[PDB]
Design a protein around this ligand. Structure first.
Ligand SMILES: CC(=O)Nc1ccc(S(=O)(=O)Nc2ccc(Oc3ccc4ccccc4c3)cc2)cc1
Length: 368
C-alpha cells in the first residue's frame, strides 16, 4: 500500500548500526540498486512503543502488531548498490514517536531518482522505540536493549526538547561523518549481521551534494543540523515543529531552506518561527499542500482505508498519493536547484512556488 518510487532507478534497502552502543549511528539506507520484500516495521517492540506513544496499554500494542507486523515496503532488501556513478546524499530525521522506517514513501521515491537516503534512528528518546547492544557479545547473539520514548512533564518541555534537538542534530552529523568515512574506504562492522557489504559504498557518494530532510520534530532537526554542520548544502523541513529550537538558531542558517507544510497542522506561533528564519540575503521557500494533515508525510497515511484513515487523522482531504507526490516533486526540484544536480527535476520548479491547484504559496496563516 506504500507507493513504489516514481523514478527510473530500482531501490534497495538495508540497515546499518555502527558502532553497537547507543552513542553509535543507527540508520536505514535507501539507494539505487541493481523482489520488493523489506519488512516495514521489523520488531514487535516498535509496536509496543507506538502503543505507549498513542496513549494505550499492552493490548493496542499486540493489535497493531497483528495488523501491520508483516506489511512490507516496496524496496529490495539487501539488493546490491547500482554501481558506476556517484550519488547525492540525503540524511533524513523522523518525528516524535516515529523511528527510522516510517518514511519509506519519501525515502524510496528519492532513491528511485538517484539519491542515497540515510534515515537515522534517533536515540534522544524521541523515538517510540529504538535499540542498541550493551556489548559485542550481546550483538553477536542479537540480544537487544530497547529504549522507549520518554514522556515529559510540562515544566520540562522547553529545556528537554531543545537538548533533544541538539542531540538529534549531533546524530545527523554523526550519520554523515560515518557515511563519508565509508565512502573513503573506512572499514565497518555492522552490529546487525546483514547480507549487504558496506564496502559497496566506497567512492559512491558525491561528497558536495549533501542535504538534510526532516518531518515534524525532524523538521526542527533540519534547522539545528544546518546551523551546526556546514557540510550540509540545503535543508527541506516537512511540517516542522519549531518549538524545540532556541532563539539563537533562526538567524544562523546559511544554507537554502525549504518549508513544506500541511494545512491542518500549522498555527501562528509555529509560522512566526519559520518567518524568523527569513533574511533577504538567504534562500527560503515555503509551500502548503491544501487539505493535508500532519500525517500525510509519514507512511501510516497509506496503511488504512480512506474512511478510517480519515477518522484516525491519518488522512486529510487531499488524496494521500497526490500529497506525497506534490511534496516529493517539490523536494526534488529544490534539491536540484541547490545541490546542482544534472537531472530534469526542474520541470517541477512551479511547485517550489506553489503553482498547483493543490498548493498555496507560503501559508494561509498571517503573522506580523
Ligand atoms: C499529540 C501528539 O504528540 N501528536 C503527534 C506528534 C508527532 C507525530 S509524527 O508524525 O511526527 N511521528 C509519528 C508518530 C507515530 C506514527 O505512527 C502512527 C501515528 C498515528 C497513528 C494514529 C492512529 C493509529 C496508528 C498511528 C500510528 C507516525 C509518525 C504525530 C502525532
Amino acid at each position: 500500500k506504500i507507493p513504489r518510487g516514481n523514478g527510473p532507478y530500482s531501490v534497495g534497502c538495508t540497515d546499518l548500526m555502527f558502532d553497537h552502543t547507543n552513542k553509535g549511528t543507527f540508520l536505514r539506507l535507501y539507494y539505487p540498486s541493481q523482489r520488493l520484500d523489506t519488512l516495514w516495521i521489523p520488531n514487535k517492540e516498535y509496536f509496543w512503543g507506538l502503543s505507549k506513544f498513542l496513549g494505550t496499554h499492552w493490548l493496542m500494542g499486540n493489535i497493531l502488531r497483528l495488523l501491520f507486523g508483516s506489511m512490507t515496503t516496496p524496496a529490495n532488501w539487501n539488493s546490491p548498490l547500482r554501481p558506476g556513478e556517484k550519488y547525492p546524499l540525503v540524511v533524513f530525521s523522523h518525528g516524535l514517536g516515529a523511528f527510522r522506517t516510517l518514511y519509506s514513501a519519501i525515502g524510496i521515491d528519492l532513491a528511485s531518482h538517484g539519491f542515497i537516503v540515510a534515515a537515522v534512528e534517533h536515540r534522544d528518546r524521541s523515538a517510540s522505540a529504538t535499540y542498541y547492544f550493551k556489548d559485542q557479545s550481546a550483538a553477536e547473539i542479537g540480544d537487544k536493549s530497547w529504549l522507549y520514548l520518554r514522556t515529559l512533564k510540562q515544566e520540562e518541555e522547553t529545556h528537554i526538547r531543545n537538548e533533544q534537538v541538539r542531540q538529534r542534530a549531533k546524530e545527523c552529523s554523526q550519520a554523515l561523518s560515518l557515511i563519508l568515512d565509508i565512502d573513503h574506504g573506512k572499514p565497518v562492522k555492522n552490529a546487525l549481521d546483514l547480507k549487504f557489504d558496506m564496502e559497496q559504498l566506497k567512492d559512491s557518494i558525491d561528497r558536495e551534494k549533501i542535504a538534510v530532510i526532516g518531518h515534524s520534530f525532524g523538521g526542527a532537526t533540519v534547522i539545528q543540523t544546518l546551523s551546526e554542520d556546514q557540510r550540509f548544502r540545503c535543508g527541506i523541513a516537512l511540517d516542522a515543529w519549531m518549538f524545540p529550537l532556541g532563539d539563537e538558531v533562526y538567524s544562523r542558517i546559511p544554507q537554502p531552506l525549504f518549508f513544506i507544510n500541511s494545512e491542518y497542522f500549522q498555527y501562528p506561533a509555529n509560522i512566526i518561527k519559520m518567518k524568523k528564519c527569513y533574511s533577504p540575503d538567504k534562500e527560503r521557500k515555503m509551500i502548503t499542500i491544501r487539505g493535508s494533515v500532519h500525517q500525510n508525510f509519514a507512511d501510516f497515511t497509506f496503511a488504512t482505508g480512506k474512511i478510517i484513515g480519515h477518522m484516525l487523522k491519518l488522512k486529510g482531504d487531499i488524496d494521500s498519493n497526490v500529497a506525497i507526490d506534490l511534496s516529493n516533486k517539490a523536494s526534488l526540484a529544490f534539491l536540484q536547484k541547490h545541490l546542482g544536480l544534472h537531472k530534469d527535476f526542474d520541470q517541477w520548479d512551479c511547485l517550489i512556488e506553489g503553482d498547483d491547484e493543490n498548493l498555496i504559496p507560503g501559508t494561509n496563516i498571517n503573522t506580523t
